[PDB]
Amino acid sequence: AYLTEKIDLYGDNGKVLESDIPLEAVTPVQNPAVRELASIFKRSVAVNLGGAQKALSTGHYANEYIHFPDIPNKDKLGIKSSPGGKYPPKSVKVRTMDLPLVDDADDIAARLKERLQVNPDDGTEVRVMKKGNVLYVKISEQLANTGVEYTTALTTTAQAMTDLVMEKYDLDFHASPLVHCAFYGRYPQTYEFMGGNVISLLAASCANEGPGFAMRNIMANHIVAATRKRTLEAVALSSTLEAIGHVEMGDAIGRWRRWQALVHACQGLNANNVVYDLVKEAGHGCTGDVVAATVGRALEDGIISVKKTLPSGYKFYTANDPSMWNAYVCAGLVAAVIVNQGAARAAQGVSSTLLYFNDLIEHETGLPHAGYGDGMGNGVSFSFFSHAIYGGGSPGIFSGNHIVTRHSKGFAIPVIAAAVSLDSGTAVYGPEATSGLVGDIFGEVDLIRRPMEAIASAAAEIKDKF
Amino acid sequence: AYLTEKIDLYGDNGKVLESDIPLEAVTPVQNPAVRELASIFKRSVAVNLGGAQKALSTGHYANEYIHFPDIPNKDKLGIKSSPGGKYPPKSVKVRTMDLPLVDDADDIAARLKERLQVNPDDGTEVRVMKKGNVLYVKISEQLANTGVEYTTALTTTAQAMTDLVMEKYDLDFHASPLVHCAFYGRYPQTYEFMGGNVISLLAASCANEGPGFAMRNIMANHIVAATRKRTLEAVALSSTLEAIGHVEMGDAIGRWRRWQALVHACQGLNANNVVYDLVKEAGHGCTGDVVAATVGRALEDGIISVKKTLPSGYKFYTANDPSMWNAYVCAGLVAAVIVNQGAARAAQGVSSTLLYFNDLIEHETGLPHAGYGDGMGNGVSFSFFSHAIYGGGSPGIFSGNHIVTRHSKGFAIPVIAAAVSLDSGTAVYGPEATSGLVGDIFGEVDLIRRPMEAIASAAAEIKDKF
Amino acid sequence: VYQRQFLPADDRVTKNRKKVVDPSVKLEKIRTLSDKDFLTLIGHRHLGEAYRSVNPPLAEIGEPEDPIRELVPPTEGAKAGDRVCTIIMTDSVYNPPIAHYTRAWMYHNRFRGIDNGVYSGRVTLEMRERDLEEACRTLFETEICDASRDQVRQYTCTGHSCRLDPDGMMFDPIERCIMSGGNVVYQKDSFGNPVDTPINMGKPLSEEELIERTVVYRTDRGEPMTREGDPGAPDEEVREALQWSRRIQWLRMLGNMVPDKIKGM
Amino acid sequence: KYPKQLFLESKNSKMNSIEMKYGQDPAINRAEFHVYGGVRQSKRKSEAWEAAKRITKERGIPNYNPDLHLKGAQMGQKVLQTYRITGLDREWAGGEDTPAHKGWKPGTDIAGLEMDDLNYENNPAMQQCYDDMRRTAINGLSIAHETIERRFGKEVTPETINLYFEMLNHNIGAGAIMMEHTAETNPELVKDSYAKCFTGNDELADALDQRFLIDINKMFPKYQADQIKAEVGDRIFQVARIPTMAVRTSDGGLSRAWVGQQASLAFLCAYDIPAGDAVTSDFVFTIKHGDVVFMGTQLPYRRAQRNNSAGGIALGYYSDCNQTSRTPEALEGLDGGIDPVKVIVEALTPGCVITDQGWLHNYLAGGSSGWSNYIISVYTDEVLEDYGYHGAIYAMDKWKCGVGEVPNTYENMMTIAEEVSRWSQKNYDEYPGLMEAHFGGSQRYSIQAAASGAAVGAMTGDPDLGNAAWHYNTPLCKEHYLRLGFYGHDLQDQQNMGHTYSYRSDQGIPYELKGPNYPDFAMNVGHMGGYIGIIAGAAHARGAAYSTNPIIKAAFADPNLQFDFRYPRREFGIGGLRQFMPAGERDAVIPPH
Ligand SMILES: C[C@@H](OP(=O)(O)O)[C@H](NC(=O)CCCCCCS)C(=O)O
Ligand SMILES: C[C@@H](OP(=O)(O)O)[C@H](NC(=O)CCCCCCS)C(=O)O
Ligand SMILES: C[C@H](O)CO[C@@H](C)CO[C@@H](C)CO
Ligand SMILES: O=S(=O)(O)CCS
Ligand SMILES: [Cl-]
Ligand SMILES: [Cl-]
Ligand SMILES: [Cl-]
Ligand SMILES: [Cl-]
Ligand SMILES: [Cl-]
Ligand SMILES: [K+]
Ligand SMILES: [Mn+2]
């Protein structure tokens, strides 16, 4: 049945965007902007013409410091290449070539669009960026929806680029493997187009932790780069990707659907201004001041009430609305990271806030924290694997598909996005290092960079359906 | 540019279905029936209520002869369970339960549909089959298109079944893992829902050989079972799945697009009645009679001509239309399997026909065989791995995603489907053994069972657009 | 109907190949085998024994309505539901009247309803049992079976590439053949099992007779596929088999680069 | 204008490798059969039968029993041939003691080996070759040093790097540094595990403790050192080898994880970083993901593997781990000129043995044979050697040029292939004893294809064109003999007549970056090692120091490796003599045995 309860959607300045929105209208199964976000991730790729050109020219194909060497000075090496030195050494050039791909980016873009297009009106887009070094590609829904997979933009663009370059420059047979390598990298020896020059926001389709995890296999650094560090937009993008992922995992179903929808609305979309209000109340303080603000707001809104007073005077609280209590804890969790990691302007403590905001909440109330164990559990695992020898890394390399951080049902990665947004440059593996091209290219897509208002406007368009 | 050349589409009885069809109109990127075939594979699953009920009742969960034992006769075992036998043994029942799922199938189907449906009239369907033992489920496009993956029908159905059973029978906490296991099997210890009771025609999304291979990871036995052994319909289903897969692989692009489209039309859709005509001409003979018929038909239609006569009198032929020549070899290849394996009514020689039809073609003409090496190459690999100790199996277990048979660009698996359709029961891993439920349940979908006429009708509807 | 040319046949060796593979050319019978001896050699069934079945008779299995299947009449073994049985032969590298790929080409041109594998050391033919028996009359009794160079052996098949024994016989680890009074005789069946009486195949051909009828090129006798002055020479100066080989390579390479590249070539 | 065949007369020791198998002229088409006593003619199989009787009595289950061979015919109704390692009489360098054996006397032959001596299952040199590949972890250290300098606030110097490496050499195998009451590994079990580094900056190299240095200037001739140092630049790369015993309990994917742990600890301990400081996670991430070179990439689900399985190793990485390219034999063996043929025929030896026996057999299939005779044929008796040099001689005379200098046209490839195919066939046809030695058609077919590709690659410098010549041998072989190889041999040969210069999605890829997961190559013996050799020789012939990855080439230039990557044919022969001591054995912690 429809999630008819009304919420207000507030922007990151704490002012209302849209009022009286049924919860149903922000869900991934309904909201056109949320669904377009998934569609753009599926259908968009970047072609690195500068990278392909450099690989062909120098022989530095693929990754890992690979180099296919061409030796132009063979007669200067001190070697004899003929028995007894009968004939002096002659150099050859057999692994490399100079093609003017960047100079020709505009014509290449036109040829690429024609190869990708199915019908003239189909919405295929190819845009020249970075002075010809990069093409942004969005394939049509017509092409993308031909079969069942999300990789069609990646695979068609790589083949179209390879074919059109072979044709445009009328290259000889020797060039076939090399031009293929320039776009595909080590494919098919690798499943990935490893070290290639066609890039998707999505990971390779071999890499899921389980069915439905593709929209979760997106690093927090990618999200922060694409939203250019605007904290609550990073939160909204991460939370919405998690929300889509949890639909695809099968967990936004039945007696869990409302719970899952409220995580997204309250933590990710600043529903009822809770996140903003909590940061405003507690921002001059510590994590614990956010704990106080969260419990106070839950009481003010009738979500919890005193259940029992023990002889010491300690009070157990009861959840009058368990799913909404959970969602308020999730909202308080992102507010707590904003206050704590925001005060330091340093992301690393996000893992500690994730654990101890939840631990303090339980000790304060006698009610279960976010995810009934997952919030503290991932506080533990994420803290460990961001401060130890065993694995992991800095906060921004985690994702909803990372083994360390996958468990929480949609409310953990957004706080990582918040913390990394607020970081002043304390990391080596920050968004600039791992996600620079992603942020520069895909961050130009307005829906990716600024999802909050798009989701709210789309919800308002459909609100009277429910 | 559009593939405007006109073909006629013939049925498997050798009579025209639709005339004057532009090649463009049968391609997966355009044809609505081809696209609906992919969509139905993506959105349909079966729920084995009888299997889930049995697992819960007996403790035979999942696969591999697993059995969680409940012991109802503990006092008859000859053991003491108390020191000194102070207290007599008492049996417990802790791993099993009896739920009347099959008897309650109609109500279960209603509860499942309500959980899966997103909006009224969205196309969600649940059908009770096998007197309650199986549900056929088709999720809405609305639900299926929410994110980027093809697994949403599988994941949502498993969770919805688990939730609704827990609710309907008001089961206690102990039941949660067990009911989950009844539907999901060993998930998430396995990526697959291994040994569970929610079944998709598609493989688990961890299992591709490369990006775009999902529509290729479908065994010939599944195709034959779903088409109920009607040879050319099995060929058409296999060829169309391969055609979709090759779009998703990125290989139906640019200077390869026409070649790839003609493989599908000529081998898979009996274009211009070539397949039927070749079988009719040569059916009373041998593989070599199909070789003669194929070369004769290519000459009759102007596809090839004599290029040079050597001093012995041997004639090299030239391809006036190389992609059409390739497609005629592919049509001859399926006709050759039909004649050779059809005469024996035994599938095993399909691998030999794949190799030697192509080898005979080259020796007969001086022109390259299907796929410039792949037809013979897969004749070699498939023959080896269906008659040796090393791996493989009988013909019906291969697919476009199997390492042995993947290489050919779309023209190999359909001949396996033909051979297995014609087999009189000479296998122990035939369609009945590997694909019985698939054939019984998904074979009821008319588009899956009988794609030829649907594809032709859909092509005629759009023919004037090119 | 188009008239096949089969393969380039510019010399004795390749004309011998064409004769083997062309189903309009009768292969001459050169020996007689009793029905008892013939079936004993095959080793799947003995004279008078009923055929075993793998499935019920075809008319009883409920074949679906299927217009394409209608166009292809089943063999007698298929109608009966016979099991599919294998026979294996090996041809020496030393001037045999048939060799391994010519077997595949011949089988696919002369016999209906086959499975067949080519290996360096043996060739399998797998057919419904009664159909296999009919095919084996050609394999065992005609000019494509020289008793010393083309032998029947179901396993432990090494010998094609071994040196000939002192009598000019190809090696058999299991010794199913022996030379006896100038005749080749199977003292064991194809499976290496005992036979009640040896199966006389008659006399082998001499080396010059084998060379006249052989399908293989051999450098030592002066007939290599590629002569000393052939590498890189123009097509008109090399054997037609090499002209053909070059063409196939060029057209596979260019066509798999871009199909249109081979138009008119 | 062709010299006497090397398989009838080795160049220096004058051994007749084929005649030695039989005591009869190999030109004679006559042999007696059933006169050898079955397996009694074999020392190893006779010894095995006696051992098997003891094993049956001890364990109560029968095992090896030659009398089970079908229909009363023991194996050995023909000669069970012995083998001579190709080319050992033409070596003059590499006489140093190694971790596995005392110095070989260069030029000494290894003849009379039985087939079972060259079975991967029985040959620890072959197993150790693979183990040395897969236990290797390679990383740039620049990011770890950057994290220390900026996030932690401590300067990195040659002195701190030396302490780091001393600590990493303590903990990579055996010890602990930071913690009380911590278990440790017996040093005897892990004496093959250590860590080194290399750099293109000679001043830095000289400032480091030389015990921890792979010295590019010492290991390589000047032109090759120059090329490698130009690529490495002013950077430091670590090369760590985890214990052989450890990978034998698990997989090569352990290596980057293990070094991630131990390198992280060595950073904490050399730089005095608090336990639990956030910087720690940058170290492990750098080692596992951020700046890492693997021998192998991951494999998809049907053949699922983490990094550093044989199936993930690109052909060109197999080419570049081989170290024959820096030997005197490869630098001056053609009358003072470079010898790319020596590079090809050595690099293809681990190429073939590891991909076919180590991987296709010991991961994908298996059993007691190791498919050993199939592959022994490519590195014994000078057969492939003669055919490969034949093509080089032919081409140098025809085109009047040196190695690497024939124009890389399709026509020139086809001409050389036609001649090498012709020569291969002439010898198999004219020497019945050779035809019987290489009794499997696959051996003979792969050998003519490999020799053709070797000649084209060595003579043009073009690795894709050299490998194109391999596939062109298919019709040249088939139309002559009317047989090829085993049932499934020519999958890749048939299709790569078309795929070599295709650019379709999973068809096009340069040979350097192909490997056992290229779908055409994923199943079958007798091919991949040949391509590996051809890639290595093509690069050598055109004047390069490596084919694919200079980091890999430098990382295997290390005398502390258990296997001698410079002279693999020799090493496999030494294992055949039971004279190769592998790493990874558990003698220190097991009873007297
Ligand atoms: C976290 C993850 O490592 P990465 O972050 O991906 O490098 C994972 N390792 C582990 O889980 C290490 C587990 C053992 C060490 C901790 C013992 S308490 C793995 O290899 O995939
Ligand atoms: C075919 C396939 O096996 P399956 O058919 O999946 O059982 C595959 N094995 C192989 O490729 C075996 C290769 C080695 C044996 C043949 C050597 S020529 C594999 O393990 O995935
Ligand atoms: C198949 C045909 O004989 C091939 O011809 C080549 C020998 C020459 O053709 C090339 C040079 C130009 O297409
Ligand atoms: O006989 S087969 O070619 O299948 C296997 C050879 S090892
Ligand atoms: Cl990728
Ligand atoms: Cl609720
Ligand atoms: Cl599954
Ligand atoms: Cl075309
Ligand atoms: Cl009878
Ligand atoms: K040193
Ligand atoms: Mn010991």
- What are the pocket residues of ligand 2 if the criterion is a CB atom closer than 6 Å to any ligand atom? B 385, 390-392, 403-404; D 302-303, 360, 364-365, 488, 522-525
Structure tokens at A137: 């590609």
C247 lines ligand 3 (CB under 6 A): yes
- Structural domain tally of chain C? 1
On whether any CB of chain C is under 8 Å from the CB of D390, the answer is no
Cis omega (within 30 of 0) for bond into A188:
yes
What is the experimental resolution, given in Å to one decimal place?
1.0
Identify whether the C-beta of residue B138 lies closer than 8 Å to the C-beta of residue B40: yes
How many other C-beta atoms are found inside a 10 Å radius of the C-beta of residue B3?
Answer: 18
Phi, psi of D112 (to 5 degrees): 75, 15
Instruction: Return all residues near A209 (Cβ < 8 A) that are at least 6 apart.
Output: A216, A217, A401, A403, A406, B191
How many other C-beta atoms are found inside a 10 Å radius of the C-beta of residue A93?
Answer: 13
Q: Is D21 exposed, middle or buried (0-12, 13-18, 19+ CB in 10 A)?
A: buried
User: Hey, which residues of A are catalytic here?
Assistant: 390
Question: B380, B384, B390, B407: which to mutate for ligand 2, most atoms within 8 A of CB?
Answer: B390
Structure tokens at A275: 């996140």
Contact A28 B146 (CB under 8 A): yes
Give A-chain residues touching B167 at CB under 8 angstroms: 254-255
How many other C-beta atoms are found inside a 10 Å radius of the C-beta of residue A230?
Answer: 16
3-state secondary structure of A440: helix
C-alpha–C-alpha distance, residues D268 and D43, integer Å: 56
Helices (H), D172-250: 202-207, 216-219, 222-232, 244-248
Helices (H), C158-262: 207-213, 240-257
C-alpha–C-alpha distance, residues D258 and B277, integer Å: 65
Q: What is the DSSP letter of A209?
A: S
Q: Which residues pair with B375 in a beta bridge?
A: none
Give B-chain residues touching A114 at CB under 8 angstroms: 1
How many other C-beta atoms are found inside a 10 Å radius of the C-beta of residue A462?
Answer: 16
Question: Residues D226-243, buried b or exposed e (16+ Cβ, 10 A)?
Answer: bbbbebbeebbbbbbbbb
Q: How far apart are the first and last CA of chain A?
A: 10
C-alpha–C-alpha distance, residues D574 and A186, integer Å: 36
C-alpha–C-alpha distance, residues D574 and D557, integer Å: 20
Contact D481 C99 (CB under 8 A): yes
Give D-chain residues touching A219 at CB under 8 angstroms: none
Q: Maximum distance among all alpha carbons in chain A?
A: 104
Q: Which residues pair with C255 in a beta bridge?
A: none
Contact C131 B344 (CB under 8 A): yes
Ramachandran region, residue C168 (left: φ > 0; alpha: ψ -120 to 50; beta: rest): left
Task: Compute the CA torsion angle B82, B87, B93, B94 (nearest 10 deg).
Answer: -40
Instruction: Return all residues near C39 (Cβ < 8 A) that are at least 6 apart.
Output: C45, C46, C47, C133
Closest residue to atom 13 of ligand 1, CA basis: A390
C 199-258 → A contacts, CB under 8 A: 253-254, 257-258
Closest residue to atom 15 of ligand 1, CA basis: A390
Identify whether the C-beta of residue B228 lies closer than 8 Å to the C-beta of residue B449: yes
How many other C-beta atoms are found inside a 10 Å radius of the C-beta of residue D121?
Answer: 16
Cis omega (within 30 of 0) for bond into B100:
no
Candidates B219, B369, B390, partner chain D, best to mutate (most D CBs within 10 A): B390
C-alpha–C-alpha distance, residues A40 and B170, integer Å: 42
Contact C69 B284 (CB under 8 A): no
Minimum distance, in Å, between the CA of residue C205 and any CA atom of chain D: 17
On whether any CB of chain D is under 8 Å from the CB of A78, the answer is yes
User: Hey, which residues of B are catalytic here?
Assistant: 390
C-alpha–C-alpha distance, residues D274 and A25, integer Å: 50
User: Domain range for residue C184?
Assistant: 1-265
| Structural method | X-ray
Q: Pairing between strand A16-22 and B315-319? A: unpaired
Identify whether the C-beta of residue D111 lies closer than 8 Å to the C-beta of residue D84: yes
Describe the crossing of helices B374-384 and B350-365 by its angle, rounded to 10 degrees. Answer: 150
Instruction: Return all residues near D266 (Cβ < 8 A) that are at least 6 apart.
Output: D164, D165, D167, D168, D171, D177
Q: What is the DSSP letter of C83?
A: P
3-state secondary structure of A10: strand
Minimum distance, in Å, between the CA of residue C182 and any CA atom of chain D: 18
| Residue A305: its H or E element | strand A304-309
Pick the ligand that lies closest to the CA of residue D210. Answer: 10
On whether any CB of chain B is under 8 Å from the CB of A154, the answer is yes
Task: Compute the CA torsion angle A3, A5, A11, A12 (nearest 10 deg).
Answer: -90
Ligand 2: atom nearest CA of D522 is: 11
The pocket of ion ligand 8, defined by CB under 5 A, consists of: B 258, 323
C-alpha–C-alpha distance, residues B247 and B400, integer Å: 13
Query: For A292-297, which contacts have Cβ atoms below 8 Å and span 24 or more sequence positions?
Result: A293/A332, A293/A335, A294/A328, A294/A329, A294/A331, A294/A332, A294/A335, A294/A336, A294/A361, A295/A361, A295/A364, A295/A365, A297/A328, A297/A332
C-alpha–C-alpha distance, residues B8 and B28, integer Å: 17
CA neighbor of C31 nearest in space, from C194, C183, C197, C206: C183
| Residue B157: its H or E element | helix B152-168
DSSP assignment string, B335-376: HHHHHHHHHHT-GGGHHHHHHHHHHHHHHHHSS--GGGGHHH
Identify whether the C-beta of residue A159 lies closer than 8 Å to the C-beta of residue A177: no
C-alpha–C-alpha distance, residues B244 and B410, integer Å: 10
Phi, psi of B251 (to 5 degrees): -100, 0
Q: Which residues pair with B304 in a beta bridge?
A: B319
Q: Chain B: list its partners (3+ Cβ pairs within 8 Å).
A: A, C, D
3-state secondary structure of C179: strand
